[PDB]
Amino acid sequence: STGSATTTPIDSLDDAYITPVQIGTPAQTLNLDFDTGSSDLWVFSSETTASEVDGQTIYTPSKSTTAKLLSGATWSISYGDGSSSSGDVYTDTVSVGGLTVTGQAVESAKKVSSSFTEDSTIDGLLGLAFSTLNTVSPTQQKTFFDNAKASLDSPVFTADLGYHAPGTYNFGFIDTTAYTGSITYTAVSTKQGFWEWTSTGYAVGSGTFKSTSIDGIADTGTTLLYLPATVVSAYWAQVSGAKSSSSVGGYVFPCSATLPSFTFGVGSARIVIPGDYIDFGPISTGSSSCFGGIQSSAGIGINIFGDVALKAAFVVFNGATTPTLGFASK
Ligand SMILES: CN(C)c1ccc(C(=O)NN)cc1
């Protein structure tokens, strides 16, 4: 089997991407944030505290003939940005882009943090990291990908995120028309439950490439690119007037600037992030200070190749017995 679904930016900044997902019978379509940095499929639901729902589409398990309470199971998750959610669990039929899993754990939110309430366009998350990170207790549950894997033509999914445009998540096949050149594969560590890999270095603009190992995670659920302070300082030093602002919470730059590109290494290959991808616009409406798309990972504890990086590439998440990541230019 295979599946293919279009993923769409939620706003003009590509702050996140949503992908339609069919849950239950008859189908209830919710727009979920596919998240390769977590392993829970959770949704706004008829059980979510009313004051914490603001425009989202909800899953109502009582209207699904295939929903079953997973008796006694609860979940609770918190993300690196400080967001969180929690609730109980149903199993139901879930389909993505024509690919169907029966008996998928669908985690129904009773509570969500304000960040989720405020994101009217995001009806929940669909985790695509390793199932060892799943938060359901007392019986840990498998991700949609993990459940689908044995049925897939190939045990892979791909992320092809657009810059200010829709893109695609494919399951079970590699679309050889979706990228240029060749895909370079690199080793993954699953020890922390993430798609964790080691970049071989970086360059700023037309500058020389610096060979240096940068461990990090491929996280479609993080907006920005978070790298070591040394690397990030070297980037922003090439932008006149750029500075780190403790008041704003990161590097800002004059909105009159033209940003240089940023290159990261994948083995002997190189992925170039155009300067435009690094512009996250005015810090507040009407401001001439703009927020940068490359920020320090210091005080996160891990480097994060978020959407800013991933959208510059066609990315293969290879879930074979020994997982690997592949990157191609596009
Ligand atoms: C507030 N929202 C929509 C979030 C979405 C995703 C994440 C995240 O860290 N995913 N790996 C955090 C927050």
Short mmCIF file of C-alpha atoms and ligand atoms in Angstrom, two decimals:
data_model
loop_
_atom_site.label_atom_id
_atom_site.label_comp_id
_atom_site.label_asym_id
_atom_site.label_seq_id
_atom_site.Cartn_x
_atom_site.Cartn_y
_atom_site.Cartn_z
CA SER A 1 0.00 0.00 0.00
CA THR A 2 0.89 3.67 -0.27
CA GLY A 3 -0.56 7.03 0.73
CA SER A 4 -0.07 10.58 -0.52
CA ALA A 5 -1.43 13.75 1.08
CA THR A 6 -0.91 17.43 0.47
CA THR A 7 0.40 19.52 3.35
CA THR A 8 -0.40 23.25 3.48
CA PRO A 9 1.20 26.12 5.43
CA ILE A 10 -1.12 27.47 8.13
CA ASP A 11 -0.14 31.10 7.49
CA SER A 12 1.98 33.41 5.36
CA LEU A 13 5.13 32.65 7.39
CA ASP A 14 5.03 28.84 7.08
CA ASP A 15 4.73 28.67 10.89
CA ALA A 16 3.48 25.08 10.55
CA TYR A 17 1.90 22.79 7.99
CA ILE A 18 -1.44 20.97 8.16
CA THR A 19 -2.44 17.77 6.42
CA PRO A 20 -6.01 16.42 6.22
CA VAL A 21 -6.57 13.11 8.05
CA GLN A 22 -9.71 10.96 8.03
CA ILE A 23 -10.68 9.53 11.43
CA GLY A 24 -13.59 7.23 12.15
CA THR A 25 -16.66 5.95 10.35
CA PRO A 26 -18.15 7.89 8.66
CA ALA A 27 -14.93 9.85 8.18
CA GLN A 28 -14.29 12.92 10.29
CA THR A 29 -11.61 14.98 8.55
CA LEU A 30 -9.25 16.90 10.84
CA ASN A 31 -6.25 18.97 9.79
CA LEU A 32 -3.25 17.67 11.70
CA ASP A 33 0.30 18.89 12.17
CA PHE A 34 2.52 15.99 11.05
CA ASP A 35 5.34 15.96 13.56
CA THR A 36 8.50 13.91 13.05
CA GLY A 37 9.66 15.12 16.49
CA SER A 38 6.95 13.37 18.54
CA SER A 39 5.03 10.10 18.60
CA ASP A 40 1.45 10.82 19.68
CA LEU A 41 -1.55 11.22 17.38
CA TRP A 42 -3.78 13.54 19.38
CA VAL A 43 -6.82 15.56 18.45
CA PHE A 44 -9.15 18.25 19.64
CA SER A 45 -12.34 16.39 20.52
CA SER A 46 -15.79 16.47 22.06
CA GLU A 47 -13.94 15.85 25.36
CA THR A 48 -11.71 18.94 25.15
CA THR A 49 -12.38 21.55 27.85
CA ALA A 50 -14.77 23.96 26.10
CA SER A 51 -12.89 27.14 27.06
CA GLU A 52 -9.77 25.68 25.41
CA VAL A 53 -11.39 25.15 22.00
CA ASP A 54 -11.31 28.17 19.59
CA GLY A 55 -12.25 27.37 15.99
CA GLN A 56 -10.71 23.90 15.71
CA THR A 57 -12.55 20.97 14.16
CA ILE A 58 -13.15 18.30 16.77
CA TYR A 59 -13.22 14.51 16.69
CA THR A 60 -16.41 13.11 18.24
CA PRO A 61 -15.85 9.43 18.97
CA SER A 62 -19.52 8.84 19.86
CA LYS A 63 -20.35 9.56 16.19
CA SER A 64 -17.87 6.96 14.88
CA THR A 65 -19.12 3.40 14.56
CA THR A 66 -15.52 2.12 14.64
CA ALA A 67 -14.34 4.08 17.72
CA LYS A 68 -13.60 2.12 20.88
CA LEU A 69 -12.43 3.50 24.21
CA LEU A 70 -8.99 2.16 25.08
CA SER A 71 -10.04 1.50 28.63
CA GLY A 72 -7.78 2.92 31.34
CA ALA A 73 -5.34 4.56 28.92
CA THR A 74 -4.27 8.17 29.39
CA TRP A 75 -1.67 10.41 27.78
CA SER A 76 0.18 13.59 28.58
CA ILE A 77 2.80 15.32 26.49
CA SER A 78 4.93 18.43 26.56
CA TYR A 79 6.92 19.87 23.68
CA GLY A 80 10.18 21.81 23.57
CA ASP A 81 8.42 25.16 23.24
CA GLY A 82 6.57 24.60 26.51
CA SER A 83 3.27 23.60 24.88
CA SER A 84 1.35 20.62 26.29
CA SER A 85 -1.80 18.53 26.06
CA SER A 86 -3.34 15.48 27.76
CA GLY A 87 -6.38 13.23 27.81
CA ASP A 88 -7.67 9.72 27.19
CA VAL A 89 -7.52 7.33 24.22
CA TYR A 90 -9.71 5.68 21.61
CA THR A 91 -8.81 3.30 18.84
CA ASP A 92 -10.33 4.04 15.45
CA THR A 93 -9.72 3.84 11.74
CA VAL A 94 -7.34 6.53 10.46
CA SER A 95 -6.56 7.27 6.82
CA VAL A 96 -3.95 9.58 5.34
CA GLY A 97 -3.94 10.21 1.63
CA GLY A 98 -5.63 6.89 0.87
CA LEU A 99 -3.56 4.78 3.31
CA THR A 100 -5.69 3.24 6.06
CA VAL A 101 -4.73 1.92 9.49
CA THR A 102 -7.36 0.15 11.56
CA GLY A 103 -7.06 0.17 15.35
CA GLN A 104 -4.92 3.33 15.46
CA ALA A 105 -4.62 4.98 18.87
CA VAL A 106 -6.35 8.35 18.62
CA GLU A 107 -5.52 10.39 21.71
CA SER A 108 -8.46 12.60 22.65
CA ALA A 109 -7.48 15.85 24.36
CA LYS A 110 -9.20 16.81 27.57
CA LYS A 111 -6.76 19.70 28.09
CA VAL A 112 -4.52 21.70 25.77
CA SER A 113 -2.17 24.63 26.45
CA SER A 114 -2.91 28.11 25.20
CA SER A 115 -0.58 27.81 22.19
CA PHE A 116 -2.80 25.05 20.79
CA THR A 117 -6.04 26.91 21.57
CA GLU A 118 -4.71 29.97 19.73
CA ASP A 119 -3.77 27.97 16.62
CA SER A 120 -7.28 27.76 15.13
CA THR A 121 -5.93 25.98 12.03
CA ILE A 122 -4.37 22.99 13.86
CA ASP A 123 -6.85 20.31 14.92
CA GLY A 124 -4.18 18.08 16.49
CA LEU A 125 -0.81 16.44 15.87
CA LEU A 126 0.20 13.25 14.09
CA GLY A 127 3.49 12.00 15.49
CA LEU A 128 6.02 10.40 13.17
CA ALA A 129 9.02 9.90 15.48
CA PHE A 130 9.73 6.45 16.96
CA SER A 131 6.99 4.74 18.97
CA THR A 132 9.29 4.52 21.99
CA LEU A 133 8.43 8.21 22.58
CA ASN A 134 4.67 7.64 22.67
CA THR A 135 3.19 8.90 25.96
CA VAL A 136 0.18 6.60 26.38
CA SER A 137 0.09 4.86 29.76
CA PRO A 138 0.00 2.11 30.93
CA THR A 139 0.23 0.54 27.46
CA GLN A 140 2.41 2.51 25.04
CA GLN A 141 0.91 2.88 21.56
CA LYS A 142 2.34 2.83 18.04
CA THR A 143 2.48 5.71 15.60
CA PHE A 144 0.47 5.75 12.41
CA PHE A 145 3.67 5.03 10.46
CA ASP A 146 4.69 2.16 12.73
CA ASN A 147 1.22 0.60 12.33
CA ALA A 148 1.24 1.07 8.54
CA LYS A 149 4.81 -0.06 7.98
CA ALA A 150 4.38 -3.76 7.29
CA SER A 151 1.67 -3.04 4.71
CA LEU A 152 3.61 -0.34 2.89
CA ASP A 153 5.32 -1.12 -0.41
CA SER A 154 8.53 0.20 1.23
CA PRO A 155 8.93 1.08 4.93
CA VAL A 156 9.40 4.82 4.35
CA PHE A 157 7.67 8.15 4.34
CA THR A 158 8.83 11.37 2.72
CA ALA A 159 8.40 15.05 3.60
CA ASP A 160 8.37 17.58 0.78
CA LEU A 161 7.47 20.86 2.45
CA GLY A 162 6.87 23.98 0.38
CA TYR A 163 8.18 27.49 0.85
CA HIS A 164 5.06 29.65 1.06
CA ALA A 165 3.29 26.87 -0.87
CA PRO A 166 1.74 23.45 -0.40
CA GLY A 167 3.84 20.30 -0.36
CA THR A 168 3.44 16.57 0.10
CA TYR A 169 3.76 13.72 2.59
CA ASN A 170 4.06 10.32 0.90
CA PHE A 171 3.92 6.94 2.63
CA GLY A 172 5.39 3.76 1.21
CA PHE A 173 7.19 5.08 -1.88
CA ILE A 174 9.78 7.58 -3.06
CA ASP A 175 8.54 9.92 -5.82
CA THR A 176 11.57 10.15 -8.08
CA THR A 177 10.00 13.15 -9.88
CA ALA A 178 9.93 15.25 -6.70
CA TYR A 179 13.65 16.03 -6.37
CA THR A 180 16.72 16.87 -8.43
CA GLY A 181 19.99 14.97 -8.46
CA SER A 182 20.43 12.08 -6.03
CA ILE A 183 19.26 11.39 -2.50
CA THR A 184 22.09 11.22 0.05
CA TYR A 185 21.38 8.91 2.95
CA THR A 186 22.87 9.36 6.41
CA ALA A 187 22.79 7.30 9.60
CA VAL A 188 20.12 7.74 12.26
CA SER A 189 20.31 7.13 16.00
CA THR A 190 17.01 6.05 17.52
CA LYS A 191 18.40 6.02 21.07
CA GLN A 192 16.41 9.09 22.12
CA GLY A 193 13.37 8.18 19.98
CA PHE A 194 13.98 10.89 17.36
CA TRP A 195 15.14 10.98 13.76
CA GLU A 196 18.56 12.02 15.05
CA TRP A 197 21.45 12.40 12.63
CA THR A 198 24.77 14.24 12.23
CA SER A 199 25.24 17.00 9.68
CA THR A 200 28.76 17.28 8.28
CA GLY A 201 29.00 21.07 8.43
CA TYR A 202 27.79 24.37 7.08
CA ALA A 203 28.45 27.44 5.00
CA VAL A 204 27.09 30.97 5.16
CA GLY A 205 26.20 32.53 1.81
CA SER A 206 29.01 32.09 -0.71
CA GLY A 207 31.50 31.43 2.09
CA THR A 208 33.74 28.43 2.53
CA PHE A 209 32.24 25.25 3.93
CA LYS A 210 33.16 24.48 7.54
CA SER A 211 33.50 20.75 8.18
CA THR A 212 32.11 20.10 11.64
CA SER A 213 29.78 17.47 13.09
CA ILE A 214 26.39 18.83 14.13
CA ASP A 215 24.11 16.29 15.82
CA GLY A 216 20.43 17.15 15.58
CA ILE A 217 16.90 15.97 14.93
CA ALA A 218 14.79 16.23 11.78
CA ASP A 219 11.59 17.78 13.20
CA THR A 220 8.76 18.77 10.86
CA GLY A 221 6.88 20.05 13.92
CA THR A 222 9.44 22.77 14.70
CA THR A 223 9.24 25.94 12.60
CA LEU A 224 12.83 27.18 12.73
CA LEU A 225 16.40 25.92 12.42
CA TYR A 226 18.11 25.71 15.84
CA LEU A 227 21.89 25.27 15.73
CA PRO A 228 24.89 25.80 18.04
CA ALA A 229 25.54 29.37 19.12
CA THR A 230 28.87 29.43 17.26
CA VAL A 231 27.20 28.55 13.94
CA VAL A 232 24.30 30.94 14.45
CA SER A 233 26.63 33.83 15.36
CA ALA A 234 28.66 33.19 12.20
CA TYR A 235 25.47 33.39 10.12
CA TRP A 236 24.05 36.59 11.63
CA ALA A 237 27.45 38.33 11.58
CA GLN A 238 26.96 38.49 7.80
CA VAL A 239 23.76 40.55 8.12
CA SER A 240 24.28 44.27 8.84
CA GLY A 241 22.46 45.32 11.98
CA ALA A 242 21.50 41.81 13.07
CA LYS A 243 21.68 41.14 16.79
CA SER A 244 20.45 38.79 19.46
CA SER A 245 17.65 40.39 21.46
CA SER A 246 16.90 39.01 24.91
CA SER A 247 13.66 41.02 24.94
CA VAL A 248 12.39 39.47 21.70
CA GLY A 249 13.87 36.01 22.38
CA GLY A 250 16.39 35.55 19.60
CA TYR A 251 18.17 37.03 16.63
CA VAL A 252 16.47 39.89 14.85
CA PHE A 253 17.59 41.80 11.79
CA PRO A 254 16.60 44.97 9.94
CA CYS A 255 13.70 44.25 7.64
CA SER A 256 15.64 46.19 4.93
CA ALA A 257 18.32 43.46 4.82
CA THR A 258 18.90 40.88 2.15
CA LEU A 259 19.67 37.59 3.92
CA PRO A 260 22.42 35.23 2.81
CA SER A 261 21.72 31.58 2.16
CA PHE A 262 22.72 28.89 4.64
CA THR A 263 24.16 25.53 3.53
CA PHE A 264 24.16 22.36 5.62
CA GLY A 265 26.05 19.16 4.92
CA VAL A 266 24.57 15.70 4.50
CA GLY A 267 27.56 13.42 4.07
CA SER A 268 29.45 14.82 1.08
CA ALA A 269 26.25 16.47 -0.23
CA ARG A 270 24.99 19.99 0.46
CA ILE A 271 21.50 21.42 0.98
CA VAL A 272 21.16 25.16 0.40
CA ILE A 273 18.53 27.12 2.32
CA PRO A 274 17.81 30.34 0.37
CA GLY A 275 18.05 33.55 2.37
CA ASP A 276 14.35 34.25 1.89
CA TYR A 277 13.50 31.08 3.86
CA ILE A 278 15.23 32.60 6.90
CA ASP A 279 12.94 35.67 7.01
CA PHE A 280 10.11 35.38 9.56
CA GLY A 281 8.96 38.96 9.14
CA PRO A 282 8.27 41.82 11.54
CA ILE A 283 8.51 40.96 15.23
CA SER A 284 5.18 42.79 15.67
CA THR A 285 2.88 44.34 13.07
CA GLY A 286 4.47 47.40 11.50
CA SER A 287 7.91 46.85 13.03
CA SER A 288 11.07 47.29 10.96
CA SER A 289 12.79 44.61 13.07
CA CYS A 290 12.38 41.15 11.57
CA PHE A 291 12.69 37.77 13.28
CA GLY A 292 15.36 35.35 12.11
CA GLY A 293 14.73 31.78 10.99
CA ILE A 294 18.06 30.49 12.29
CA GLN A 295 18.32 30.62 16.08
CA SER A 296 20.56 29.25 18.80
CA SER A 297 19.85 25.82 20.25
CA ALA A 298 21.65 26.73 23.48
CA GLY A 299 19.27 25.98 26.33
CA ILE A 300 17.27 23.50 24.25
CA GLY A 301 19.75 20.67 24.72
CA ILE A 302 19.53 19.51 21.11
CA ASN A 303 19.95 20.99 17.62
CA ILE A 304 16.75 20.97 15.59
CA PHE A 305 16.51 20.82 11.81
CA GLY A 306 13.01 22.24 11.68
CA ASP A 307 10.91 23.40 8.76
CA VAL A 308 13.32 26.17 7.67
CA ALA A 309 15.87 23.46 6.87
CA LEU A 310 13.61 20.61 5.82
CA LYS A 311 11.60 22.65 3.32
CA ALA A 312 14.79 23.25 1.33
CA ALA A 313 14.99 19.48 0.68
CA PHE A 314 13.13 16.36 -0.29
CA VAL A 315 13.51 14.27 2.87
CA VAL A 316 13.21 10.50 3.18
CA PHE A 317 12.43 9.02 6.57
CA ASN A 318 13.55 5.42 6.05
CA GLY A 319 12.02 3.15 8.70
CA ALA A 320 13.75 -0.05 7.65
CA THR A 321 15.24 -2.28 10.35
CA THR A 322 18.20 0.09 10.44
CA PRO A 323 16.61 3.50 9.94
CA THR A 324 18.28 6.21 7.87
CA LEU A 325 17.46 9.73 6.62
CA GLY A 326 17.81 10.83 3.02
CA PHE A 327 18.11 14.39 1.68
CA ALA A 328 17.91 15.62 -1.91
CA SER A 329 17.80 19.08 -3.40
CA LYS A 330 14.60 20.01 -5.23
C1 LIG B 1 1.89 24.81 19.38
N1 LIG B 1 2.11 23.82 18.33
C2 LIG B 1 1.19 23.82 17.21
C3 LIG B 1 3.19 22.96 18.38
C4 LIG B 1 3.40 22.02 17.37
C5 LIG B 1 4.50 21.18 17.39
C6 LIG B 1 5.44 21.26 18.41
C7 LIG B 1 6.70 20.46 18.41
O1 LIG B 1 7.66 20.77 19.11
N2 LIG B 1 6.76 19.40 17.59
N3 LIG B 1 7.92 18.60 17.51
C8 LIG B 1 5.22 22.19 19.43
C9 LIG B 1 4.11 23.02 19.42
#
